[PDB]
Amino acid sequence: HSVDALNATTIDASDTVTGDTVDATTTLTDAAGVSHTGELEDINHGSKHEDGGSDEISVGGLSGDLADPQDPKAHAASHSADSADEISVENLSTTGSADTVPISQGDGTLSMGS
Amino acid sequence: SVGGLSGDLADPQDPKAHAASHSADSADEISVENLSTTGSADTVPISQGDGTLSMGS
Ligand SMILES: [Zn+2]
């Protein structure tokens, strides 16, 4: 059967319902059975999630290490002689000439004495 | 891209260069009396020149 304009209440087909434009006001129910009532995800959308864009995501609790190095906490307090992360003074730098020694000036401050 | 996103990762991250943030004046702090040495009792850090410290007596 062939028409111009089919005006109906309900339409139901046992094979393809093709159209070079499909228009779903009010509801869409997919092949699994989820009944959408708003706009849908285009492929390659991910840019939207990035800083300040619409539908931004939290990184809180996500896993793995980044290819790029990151600003850490202020974390000097994480190092000590007792910890698995270890640094020793014989590894450390100084501007002082040969036979110079680190000595305290008071006022929290170290210096190269002799 | 993760650039400009917010939150704390469950796995720790390889840090940016940050030695300056361990200064006497910075917003976090470490002191020499906290630090290790392999040197025996009464050994003292002494400079050999060439930027480098050593455990002498
Ligand atoms: Zn660090």
From TrEMBL, chain B:
<feature type="binding site">
    <location>
        <position position="18"/>
    </location>
    <ligand>
        <name>Zn(2+) 2</name>
    </ligand>
</feature>
<protein>
    <submittedName>
        <fullName>Uncharacterized protein</fullName>
    </submittedName>
</protein>
<feature type="binding site">
    <location>
        <position position="22"/>
    </location>
    <ligand>
        <name>Zn(2+) 2</name>
    </ligand>
</feature>
